[PDB]
Design a protein around this ligand. Structure first.
Ligand SMILES: Nc1ncnc2c1ncn2[C@@H]1O[C@H](COP(=O)(O)OP(=O)(O)OP(=O)(O)O)[C@@H](O)[C@H]1O
Ligand SMILES: Nc1ncnc2c1ncn2[C@@H]1O[C@H](COP(=O)(O)OP(=O)(O)OP(=O)(O)O)[C@@H](O)[C@H]1O
Lengths: 367, 367
């Protein structure tokens, strides 16, 4: 429930810096970050299986860096095959006889209720070698939902599950949290999941903590370029611009286009010098039909991905490196090489200084 | 490259009731289906890691049910991985080009260009033990990539990766499929990935092949309730309706609503009988705003998930036992209890018979 300058490292390969997390009791916290940033290591250190090179681990109240993996209040172990190849499903799931707590021995009343939510009922007498990746995965989860620790440490527990099934499990896991009221430390790559379950999201990046905030705060108010480009599916579009003017709460920038159009952005303005080279971000879903008016960008359709509910059009614009990704509702029929124009809304624009830190958007978004 | 009446069972449990597929050479085919429907198995039968109870498998153009795995022309990459802990990352990815007689001149070269795209260049001298899920998984892909088989069998090869990196790999794997142009049998649960990469999609259901088609073919025209309920993120909503009338290319149904509203659907009508109890399907993203539509449904907001780019609102309607899910663009503030309304667009409504088979939709959709 609490870290303090927890630094981990092995040689000159520092996996984690002085991260300072403050997880309250019964809070649902998910960890997200680029592959390699230190999410799994962090979760393990919070438990056993991994040492703590420096810092304090306040679980409950007093430190627990030396406490044996046994009693901590933790309940980890996850993802397809971590199960005993000789025991059965019911046997593996009902291993909650000694996992940091005090339970009876007629708990069959729960191992049967858990295998129910995980739709594993008809597989209780099954052996691991007889379960699919997805099935094994849920068994591994039951083992933890059965023990019912004081603090769960889930690590991508819902992987290997079809979409429909994965939605039901999100519901189940959400209930198991608004009931046991325990503390949860979830780790995932599924961003939709993060936003739906998380009651506070932690974004890691190369060992360091990038930002911590609620779902919509991270989405709407990334503190820097990195976080901005990490939260949100089709990465946020980034255009190179130049600050031409400065007000108290404006900051005018010049788009690299041939026409060199300028526009006033509802941004911080603090520490923004005229003439500075800055990064302007705009999300694929925030771009406009262009049918309306104002700031417009035109280019050639490079890619077009059909998703049934929406269409993502990749547009190439002169003077801009990478294509500009744009998402539009429904099936939209356009071809490659075609000419496409979109509208760039100033309220929904982000601006990052050369150092990458953000210029606190002033526009108030609901939430 | 071809299956006929292929059957597979473990004792008394069948897992592939005679499936018939016809994967053309060079095609990118993705397999989707409920957890434990038989995706990995079917994949391990094309490789040889599993025995074919009945039927004939014709990889290339010759029956291979009894051919040894190592000599089928198949290069597979599953979840179990293949990172030999005694070999360095660079040592792996090359191990594949073992007997291929590849020489340090040809190999080591493509091992470098591959460690580049997969972004492991800074990890060659590493060892599986000192890596992370996502990293190890790219390494595994690296092996099969470097070996450039004649047939790729990818089993959820991009899981364990952040959304950004994953999108990048989808572009790489896609480019790799264009460059070489060899057959690829991809298994995944990520429906956006399927829709994105696939040329054809196979939907499996409890060992059987439910439907085969191009992505938009399955999204707009599911052959049955099962596929309808399977393809598409927030699951299609289903409403019990009664057939009140039937015309040429029509069919009129009565909604569960207390006002027993009857609405005509541009649907097949073939094998539709007045009085039958059918299922009406409508996707959360196809429901319309209340004011801009006829045939409205009002109810109590139960859940509201804020995804950032959109808002999903579950509505309990006095009639349907299941909550009706609705997707609305952008951030939408609604109180968990509010009265909400939505439109039921007839042209985008699917109709399923009592036996679950769909009544061919006559509305032409773009695609
Ligand atoms: N035994 C080890 N020795 C040295 N460095 C290690 C070791 N195990 C992990 N690491 C380092 O820590 C980082 C990895 O792992 P972690 O397992 O913390 O990643 P994640 O952040 O959980 O990423 P992923 O999404 O890929 O699972 C790696 O990039 C690697 O450099
Ligand atoms: N050794 C076995 N004995 C009996 N049944 C088995 C065995 N191995 C797998 N199965 C059955 O085959 C089905 C599973 O596996 P497959 O491995 O074919 O699943 P998938 O379709 O890849 O699903 P998942 O997404 O969950 O990985 C399971 O539902 C299981 O009942």
């Amino acid at each position: 429930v609490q870290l303090q300058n927890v630094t981990k490292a092995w040689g000159e390969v520092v996996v984690s810096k002085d991260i300072n997390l403050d997880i309250h009791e019964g809070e649902f916290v998910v960890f997200v970050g680029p592959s390699g940033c230190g999410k799994s290591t962090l979760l393990r250190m919070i438990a056993g299986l991994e040492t703590i090179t420096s810092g304090d681990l306040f679980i409950g109240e007093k430190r627990m860096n030396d406490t044996p993996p046994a009693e901590r209040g933790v309940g980890m172990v996850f993802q397809s095959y971590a199960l005993y190849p000789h025991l059965s499903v019911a046997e593996n799931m009902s291993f909650g006889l000694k996992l940091a707590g005090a339970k009876k021995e007629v708990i069959n009343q729960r191992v049967n209720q858990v295998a129910e939510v995980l739709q594993l009922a008809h597989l209780l007498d099954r052996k691991p070698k007889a379960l699919s990746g997805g099935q094994r995965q849920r068994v591994a989860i039951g083992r933890t939902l059965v023990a019912e620790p004081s603090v769960f440490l889930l690590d991508e527990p819902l992987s290997n599950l079809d979409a429909a099934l994965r939605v039901q499990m999100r519901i189940e896991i959400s209930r198991l949290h608004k009931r046991l009221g325990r503390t949860m430390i979830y780790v995932t790559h599924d961003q939709v999941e993060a936003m739906t379950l998380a009651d506070k999201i932690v974004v890691l990046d190369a060992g360091r903590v990038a930002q911590v905030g609620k779902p919509l705060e991270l989405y709407h108010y990334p503190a820097d370029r990195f976080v901005a480009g990490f939260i949100g599916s089709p990465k946020m579009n980034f255009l190179p611009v130049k600050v031409t003017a400065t007000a108290i709460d404006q900051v005018q920038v010049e788009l690299p286009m041939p026409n060199r159009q300028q526009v006033w952005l509802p941004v911080e303005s603090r520490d923004v010098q005229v003439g500075a080279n800055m990064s302007l971000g705009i999300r694929p879903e925030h771009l406009l039909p262009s049918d309306i008016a104002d700031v417009i960008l035109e280019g050639e359709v490079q890619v077009v991905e059909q998703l049934g509910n929406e269409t993502q059009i990749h547009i190439q614009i002169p003077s801009i490196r990478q294509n500009l990704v744009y998402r539009q509702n429904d099936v939209v029929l356009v071809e490659e090489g075609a000419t496409f124009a979109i509208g760039l809304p100033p309220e929904r624009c982000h601006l990052f200084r050369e150092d990458g830190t953000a210029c606190r958007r002033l526009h108030k978004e609901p939430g």
